[PDB]
Design a binder for this molecule. Sequence first.
Ligand SMILES: NC(=O)c1ccc2c(c1)CCCO2
Length: 209
Amino acid sequence: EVETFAFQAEIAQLMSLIINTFYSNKEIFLRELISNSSDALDKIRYESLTDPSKLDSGKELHINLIPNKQDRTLTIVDTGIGMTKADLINNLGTIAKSGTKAFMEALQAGADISMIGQFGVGFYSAYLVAEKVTVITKHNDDEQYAWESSAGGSFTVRTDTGEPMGRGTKVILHLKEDQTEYLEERRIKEIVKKHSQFIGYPITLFVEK
Ligand SMILES: NC(=O)c1ccc2c(c1)CCCO2
């Protein structure tokens, strides 16, 4: 059973801007997703200090980067706090509305797209390089869900029947045809070293084949 939702108009406008604006420095998408993963890992780690059972779904706190040239996907996996169905449908878009407005005014005042993370909407930088984004997520308090959007104003949510994750978030970037450089090991290593060198969780870059 697949549910289809409309983005809020302001979020649809942000995604169109990200997709349509000429902006060569696309590699910052990875910094934003890794930073999002680090934030999610901070949250479950802090919650586990007063409720150790919150780690019954997985003790390991890490980030995995998985390229797949056959599928042309780059997957960012973390074992963070995960995301509820209400997060996917309502809560994140509510917070994103005010950050999008602030980001919009900042851009007209001279800011650039690489500053997107300062406004809490860095996730949408994924559409700098991805024609479609699939998000698999599991929060301790909810079921495992699959969120998906190719932009165009709508997204879907379904219960995920795939491999159980235990806890966390998997962001699957279906890359645009001219953005396959982000499947190369040397390119990903360069970006992580440049932008994410002090993340306080192990980042493992998987090797292809
Ligand atoms: N607004 C945000 O910062 C955000 C983050 C993650 C995320 C979404 C939105 C949409 C659902 C899938 O995952």
